Amino acid sequence: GSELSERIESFVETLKRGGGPRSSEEMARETLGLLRQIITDHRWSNAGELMELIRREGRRMTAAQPSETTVGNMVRRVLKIIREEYGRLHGQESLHKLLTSEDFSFHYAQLQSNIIEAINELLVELEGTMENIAAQALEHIHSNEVIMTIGFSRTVEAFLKEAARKRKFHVIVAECAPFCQGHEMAVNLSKAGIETTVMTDAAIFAVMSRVNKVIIGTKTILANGALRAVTGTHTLALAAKHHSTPLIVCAPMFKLSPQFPNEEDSFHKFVAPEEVLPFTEGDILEKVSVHCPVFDYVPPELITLFISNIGGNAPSYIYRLMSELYHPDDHVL
Amino acid sequence: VPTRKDYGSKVSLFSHLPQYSRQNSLTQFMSIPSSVIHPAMVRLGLQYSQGLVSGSNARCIALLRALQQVIQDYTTPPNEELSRDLVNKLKPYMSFLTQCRPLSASMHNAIKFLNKEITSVGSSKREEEAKSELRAAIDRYVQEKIVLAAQAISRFAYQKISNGDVILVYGCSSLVSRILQEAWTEGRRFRVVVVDSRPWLEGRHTLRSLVHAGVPASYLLIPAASYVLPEVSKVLLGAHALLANGSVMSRVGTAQLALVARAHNVPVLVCCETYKFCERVQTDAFVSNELDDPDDLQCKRGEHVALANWQNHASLRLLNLVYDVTPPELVDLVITELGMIPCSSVPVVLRVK
Amino acid sequence: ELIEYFKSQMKEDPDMASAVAAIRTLLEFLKRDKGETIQGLRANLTSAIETLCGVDSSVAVSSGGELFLRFISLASLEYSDYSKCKKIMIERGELFLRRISLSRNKIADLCHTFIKDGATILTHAYSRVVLRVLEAAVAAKKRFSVYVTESQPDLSGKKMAKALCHLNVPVTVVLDAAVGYIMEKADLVIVGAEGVVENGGIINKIGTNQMAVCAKAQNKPFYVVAESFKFVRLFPLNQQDVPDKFKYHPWVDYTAPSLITLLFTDLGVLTPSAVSDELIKLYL
Numbered sequence A: 001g002s003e004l005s006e007r008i009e010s011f012v013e014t015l016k017r018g019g020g021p022r023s024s025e026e027m028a029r030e031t032l033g034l035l036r037q038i039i040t041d042h043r044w045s046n047a048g049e050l051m052e053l054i055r056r057e058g059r060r061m062t063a064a065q066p067s068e069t070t071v072g073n074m075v076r077r078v079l080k081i082i083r084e085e086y087g088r089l090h091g092q093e094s095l096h097k098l099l100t101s102e103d104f105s106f107h108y109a110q111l112q113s114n115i116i117e118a119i120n121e122l123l124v125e126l127e128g129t130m131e132n133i134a135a136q137a138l139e140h141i142h143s144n145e146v147i148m149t150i151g152f153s154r155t156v157e158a159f160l161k162e163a164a165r166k167r168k169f170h171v172i173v174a175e176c177a178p179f180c181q182g183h184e185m186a187v188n189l190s191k192a193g194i195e196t197t198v199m200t201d202a203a204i205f206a207v208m209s210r211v212n213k214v215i216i217g218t219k220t221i222l223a224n225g226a227l228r229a230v231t232g233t234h235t236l237a238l239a240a241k242h243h244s245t246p247l248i249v250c251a252p253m254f255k256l257s258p259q260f261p262n263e264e265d266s267f268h269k270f271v272a273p274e275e276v277l278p279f280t281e282g283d284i285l286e287k288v289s290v291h292c293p294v295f296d297y298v299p300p301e302l303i304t305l306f307i308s309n310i311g312g313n314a315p316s317y318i319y320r321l322m323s324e325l326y327h328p329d330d331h332v333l
Numbered sequence B: 001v002p003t004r005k006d007y008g009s010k011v012s013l014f015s016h017l018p019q020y021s022r023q024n025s026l027t028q029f030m031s032i033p034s035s036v037i038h039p040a041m042v043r044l045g046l047q048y049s050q051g052l053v054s055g056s057n058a059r060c061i062a063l064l065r066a067l068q069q070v071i072q073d074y075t076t077p078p079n080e081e082l083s084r085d086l087v088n089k090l091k092p093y094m095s096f097l098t099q100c101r102p103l104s105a106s107m108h109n110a111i112k113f114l115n116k117e118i119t120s121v122g123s124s125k126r127e128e129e130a131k132s133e134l135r136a137a138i139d140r141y142v143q144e145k146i147v148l149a150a151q152a153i154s155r156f157a158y159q160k161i162s163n164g165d166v167i168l169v170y171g172c173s174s175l176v177s178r179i180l181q182e183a184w185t186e187g188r189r190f191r192v193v194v195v196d197s198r199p200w201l202e203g204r205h206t207l208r209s210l211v212h213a214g215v216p217a218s219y220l221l222i223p224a225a226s227y228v229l230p231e232v233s234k235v236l237l238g239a240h241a242l243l244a245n246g247s248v249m250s251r252v253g254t255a256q257l258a259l260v261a262r263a264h265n266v267p268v269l270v271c272c273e274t275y276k277f278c279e280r281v282q283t284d285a286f287v288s289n290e291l292d293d294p295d296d297l298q299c300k301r302g303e304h305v306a307l308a309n310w311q312n313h314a315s316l317r318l319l320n321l322v323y324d325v326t327p328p329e330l331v332d333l334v335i336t337e338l339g340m341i342p343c344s345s346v347p348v349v350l351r352v353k
Numbered sequence C: 001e002l003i004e005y006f007k008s009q010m011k012e013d014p015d016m017a018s019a020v021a022a023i024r025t026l027l028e029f030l031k032r033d034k035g036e037t038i039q040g041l042r043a044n045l046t047s048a049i050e051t052l053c054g055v056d057s058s059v060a061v062s063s064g065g066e067l068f069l070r071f072i073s074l075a076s077l078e079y080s081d082y083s084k085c086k087k088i089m090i091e092r093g094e095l096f097l098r099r100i101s102l103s104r105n106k107i108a109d110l111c112h113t114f115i116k117d118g119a120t121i122l123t124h125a126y127s128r129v130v131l132r133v134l135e136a137a138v139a140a141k142k143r144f145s146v147y148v149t150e151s152q153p154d155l156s157g158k159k160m161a162k163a164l165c166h167l168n169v170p171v172t173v174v175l176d177a178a179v180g181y182i183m184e185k186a187d188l189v190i191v192g193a194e195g196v197v198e199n200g201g202i203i204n205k206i207g208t209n210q211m212a213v214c215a216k217a218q219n220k221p222f223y224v225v226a227e228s229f230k231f232v233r234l235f236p237l238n239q240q241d242v243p244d245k246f247k248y249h250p251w252v253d254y255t256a257p258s259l260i261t262l263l264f265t266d267l268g269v270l271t272p273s274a275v276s277d278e279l280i281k282l283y284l
Helices: A002-017 A024-040 A047-064 A069-090 A095-099 A111-134 A154-163 A182-190 A233-242 A315-323 B039-050 B057-072 B082-100 B105-119 B127-156 B174-186 B203-211 B222-231 B255-262 B346-352 C004-010 C018-031 C038-055 C059-075 C084-100 C103-114 C128-138 C157-166 C176-185 C209-217 C275-282
Strands: A146-150 A170-174 A196-199 A213-216 A227-230 A247-250 A295-298 A305-308 A311-313 B166-170 B191-196 B217-221 B234-238 B248-251 B268-271 B323-326 B333-335 C119-123 C144-149 C171-174 C188-191 C202-204 C222-225 C253-255 C262-265 C268-270
Touching (some): A024 A111, A154 A213, A170 A182, A227 A233, A311 A315, B057 B082, B105 B127, B166 B174, B166 B203, B174 B203, B174 B234, B191 B222, B234 B255, C004 C038, C018 C059, C103 C128, C144 C157
Parallel strands (some): A213 A247, C119 C144
Antiparallel strands (some): B248 B323
């Protein structure tokens, strides 16, 4: 049906033009649903044609917006799911396989059904991720503790508001200069009585000597444990490393991207310079170069822990989690 | 079972941890012939409270023996299945043991393994057969998780000890003492520097254990560790638990020793078995620790005791920590029964088994 | 016996590694073996690995020998006949030798992406893997500069500089004592490795640890390119813990994984925390 075509085109233009789903969870949910509708409302005899069309759709979606990595993550997860289902109904690279050792043209009828059910489980796991990070609040926050967070993150907000119903601590929010979204999080935290404080980015280091723990979130996580966070987060990580302050990252499993930090000159998202320098400045705008990057790169050695729906892990283990979610042939997509 | 009462004023930073007194106990409000709690469990809890069993593997062995005795004295009621009934019955015992003394990581792992073994019991299995199989499984666990797991670690740590080495140990550890004794018996010639700390002073348990073996040993306190480290070749430390993030949870004087050893270019070695590996993580000794009896910090220096009556002063707090956490960057080598693996391979061992 | 002459004549291809030639010799002598038991075969091949390591003191030869022994022990667990097992071992060794020869290009095509335009790379000595990575980037229409250390023990940096000049790449030769001088003018450090230890560090030419320390002191990324058959289960606690059979003026030294950023193997781009994972999964 052409309804799927209209849906795909509308989603592509919604990603390419502006912001659609304003939360990573809803973005992943609609991505999974659109991939399920593509799987159902299409004719594919074998798994090869289905994998090819899914790869083409994911490629065009990532071409619509390269920074929105959640769509590509969901596409690669669906591809991996199809791969397990095909391998199960039929009958990673390591040293053991290199010492003790394939095409998808075969056809199966019920296979598609199975795949659907598999997608189904992933769907439910979504509505757990947030709370699966929140329920681990009291295990990482003790009473009378100073905590600093940057920007607006729903996961960190839920973490703090769940750790505050039984403990009482100090929270400091540093608003980002281009997009001052820390004020909204500060108001939402003060509405629950958590003794929240608001500050700018320039003071992040100034008060860093009086902070016991830093808890942040991110847009996506790279394969080596690095981070693609909001701008100003690398400075926060450097300040936490200077004072040996532990840095905790709240991120679900759908924010893991198999890509490595080798796509420079496009890693950061550049927006109009109106946010940094206004248009009413005058004739100086013709000789001044203004750049407003939205995201920035955070190295893995500046991170202490990763909290996800499966629990607490170290960055030096992220390489394993990727291998448990995506296939090495779907990294380039 | 009445809950144990708190003693003294706790520190504000550690106000979320229970602080008990060794003098008072719960057995005052229980039956002399124990009915709700098993008599073996009551004896084990009393020994844990009085400090008669103050180790890590010894506590696990005592708990497993008490559980074997309880299973032997267990009788399944009618209309009930053993798989659920035994699990529901063993829960108040663990609650009482935790009330006596906070459980260790080895005890938690043993409890989890026993609960899994009991839940994995078939329905058609007879009662006596199931009890005997559970006892045999506990015996095999004790054999291949503590006894057989120590010989492999002793054999792996033998090739890391050379003639003329100066090994620095801390506190009392069964694995470290066994490794040193076996290395001296094999033919290695070295000397050990024993480090101790107040108020337990359990390092003397190792010192007199080396003199009886023939190893030349020295003795000093933890504030004088930076003085003897320039002459130390390597540092052997014991571990109570290895967290899933690589951090080492051990006696409070472990992370400090590992930090001071780094400033002197002394390699730090950690010895631990694979059954003490925890899937949980921890970044500091504030989120999870144990507050011992604060009256143990009192010492008689000269004629009087400065902390004789510390409860009279309102703003005076006495902190007596038990455990601490060492970051993975301060640990160089971790010796297990599977081999000499780095401190970052803790989740891998947690994933294989 | 007259086995080392077959290994020396196996290295007539100047691009073939030492571990690859050792594994080829081991497989050839396994094919030509006339034993009828698996224990005798294992003993003969352990003795042959010892004889081969007696000639070449490289860590790669020992790594390849241990890998071959592990492959034999793994293939001898399913069939338990020594004839079926022998044919399966021959086929698997042929496939393994065919797959190993494609590791250099697999590392190059995956590592050349980390090199930007107008960058400045720093290399220590002559390495075929680094040379392949550099020649795979110039084929992708990229321009950069290379600074190669002289490697005073035996002049290997001059050979690398001549190769880069033949490949039309601007290369400047620096002294072994000037590494701390040009470190501020480099963007990344790409070096080879003769053997990857359990903890993730490397065992490379003597002038590698100081360069890694200087790069860490200036926040310069330190990349290491090495194959997978160089994974050895060793845990050196310091420089003196390295066995003397590999250092013999020392000819090799150890670099801790705390100074290494990433590793580029035929298994992909890994962290220093992934080598121990593979070594544990292999049960070497």
